[PDB]
Amino acid sequence: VLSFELLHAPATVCGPKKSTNLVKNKCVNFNFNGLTGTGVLTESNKKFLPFQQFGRDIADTTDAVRDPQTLEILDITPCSFGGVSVITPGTNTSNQVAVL
Amino acid sequence: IYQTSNFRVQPTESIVRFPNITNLCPFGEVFNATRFASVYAWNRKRISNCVADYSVLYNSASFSTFKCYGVSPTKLNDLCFTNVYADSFVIRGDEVRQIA
Amino acid sequence: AYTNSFTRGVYYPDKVFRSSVLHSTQDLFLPFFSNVTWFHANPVLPFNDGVYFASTNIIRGWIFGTTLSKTQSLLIVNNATNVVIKVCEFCTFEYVSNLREFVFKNYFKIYSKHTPILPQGFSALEPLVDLPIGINITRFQTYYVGYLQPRTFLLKYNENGTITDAVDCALDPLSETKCTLKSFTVEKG
Amino acid sequence: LVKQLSSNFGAISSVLNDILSRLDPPEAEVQIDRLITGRLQSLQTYVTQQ
Amino acid sequence: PSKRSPIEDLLFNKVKFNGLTVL
Ligand SMILES: *[C@@H]1O[C@H](CO)[C@@H](O)[C@H](O)[C@H]1NC(C)=O
Ligand SMILES: *[C@@H]1O[C@H](CO)[C@@H](O)[C@H](O)[C@H]1NC(C)=O
Ligand SMILES: *[C@@H]1O[C@H](CO)[C@@H](O)[C@H](O)[C@H]1NC(C)=O
Ligand SMILES: *[C@@H]1O[C@H](CO)[C@@H](O)[C@H](O)[C@H]1NC(C)=O
């Protein structure tokens, strides 16, 4: 019988997967020994205690993550998004549009 | 003026960062053991700091029961844990359905 | 003699960074303004669920175990050179790594913090040891001795992520109102 | 409304990607349905109050 | 700079997301 816990503590065992290099300022889907997510990675100046790895905010969201291998702190921000509105006159008058 | 759809930026790259270690996990010492223990005195072994590989276990084809609760066996080589508990014992064939 | 705990014995509940946020959590804590037994110049004491230890060179270390003999027991003895940690029958495990506070609790978790020259004030405690050994402990032997209880707490983080204040949610009706409002200041009403 | 985003609603976890990367589509649908129902009810209540 | 009365100034001086926006 094998029993797991899948806690958020610093991981110890992992799959036989490989590792790539860090890329910044580009929308990427990071996977740091788990913890899947998409966003833009920059350099975070937030002070971390030696035992502190994960960052969190008023509504969590895990804004800060520490590198597992190189042991560097990072900041996480979601990619830009928004709605689209179309500005048009009546189709009787014309058929040109402008988007917002 | 009307609202039509939403705008969202797509990701471009993939980032994977796992702690690089090479300690192959000691599963043989438990599966191949000469003498197991009585069910009333089962034996527990902790596991840590190892690179597990459950694919080889799942493809041994010598097992008559492989039931995983709360995680699918195929997706087991993609996620990391904090510690793994392995315990073993020997019981009759009728009672095998009571371990659930 | 006895002494009141004032506001002492608050550690970091987890290893997750937070900043400028009022977070409420539940864990084993030393109740505020509680009585702590005083010892000086040394018998065994029960463990229960977690023990608070504080003292003010001469102190050697701490030992744990149900019989403290014939069954497995803990053994944590400090040294001038490094520190000695081993577990076996008296091995089964070995490890080497003013005011001194410790929040030993039970795997085995240990927190520590040292402050210059019990005083009135607040100071948090940081974790140091997370050894994964599982065994029952009932008796403790080795100052002052505290105990832990399951009381929820309200924690305050400053801009740098360091705990500066806390509220005992089950102490007084004023504290209950503070915890309900999630604020450190309450307006008339 | 924002705080209501961190409730299990009976599912194994409150993280969609977590429960998607752990279970196969044969049995992730029940958890997804539970989360969907909870969040939909929360949105309905918020809209009525507004 | 904003061309408002002293009383209006006094009144005016006395008073990261997922799908939420303000128009
Ligand atoms: C990962 O590799 C880097 C460079 O090879 C090394 O510094 C680091 O210690 C490795 N991580 C682990 C967990 O061994
Ligand atoms: C146990 O022994 C078999 C015999 O070949 C081997 O294939 C296997 O890798 C060993 N370990 C486990 C965990 O089965
Ligand atoms: C430790 O001793 C107590 C007292 O007899 C007992 O209740 C408890 O079950 C023991 N621990 C374990 C793991 O058996
Ligand atoms: C936080 O750290 C900064 C240094 O980065 C320091 O100037 C400041 O005083 C600290 N905050 C407090 C409340 O001490």
Experimental method: cryo-EM
Q: Which mutation among B25, B29, B30, B31 tests ligand 2's pocket best, with the greatest number of atoms within 8 A of CB?
A: B31
Contact criterion met (CB below 8 Å) for A56 and C17: yes
What is the b/e burial string over A13-29, where b = at least 16 CB atoms within 10 angstroms of the residue's CB?
Answer: bbbeeeeeeeeeeebbe
Q: Atom 2 in ligand 3: which residue has the minimum CA distance?
A: C136
> Taking the CB of residue C11, how many other CB atoms lie within 10 A of it?
21
Contact criterion met (CB below 8 Å) for E3 and A65: no
- Phi and psi at C22, nearest 5°, equal -95, 105
The tokens for A74 are 């990072």
Specify the 3-state DSSP secondary structure of A75: strand
DSSP code at position A60? B
Provide the CATH topology of domain C2-189: Jelly Rolls (2.60.120)
- Phi and psi at B57, nearest 5°, equal -65, -40
Contact criterion met (CB below 8 Å) for C30 and C159: no
The tokens for C124 are 């948090």
Chain B residues with CB-CB distance to C132 below 8 A: 46, 48, 83
Q: Is E21 on the interface with A (CB under 8 A)?
A: yes
C7: nearest Cα among C33, C37, C35: C33
Resolution in A, one decimal? Answer: 3.3
Q: Is B46 on the interface with C (CB under 8 A)?
A: yes
Q: Atom 3 in ligand 1: which residue has the minimum CA distance?
A: A69
Instruction: Quote the CA–CA distance of C183 and C85 in Å, as a whole number.
Output: 43
Instruction: Quote the CA–CA distance of B5 and A84 in Å, as a whole number.
Output: 6
Contact criterion met (CB below 8 Å) for C108 and C129: yes
Q: Locate tokens 């019981």: which residue?
A: B91
Specify the 3-state DSSP secondary structure of B32: coil
Specify the 3-state DSSP secondary structure of B87: strand
DSSP code at position A81? E
C96 Cβ partners below 8 Å, 6+ apart? C82, C83, C84, C85
Instruction: Quote the CA–CA distance of B27 and B39 in Å, as a whole number.
Output: 20
C158 Cβ partners below 8 Å, 6+ apart? C19, C20, C164
Smallest Cα distance from B95 to chain A, Å = 15
Q: Locate tokens 């804590």: which residue?
A: C29
> Taking the CB of residue C56, how many other CB atoms lie within 10 A of it?
10
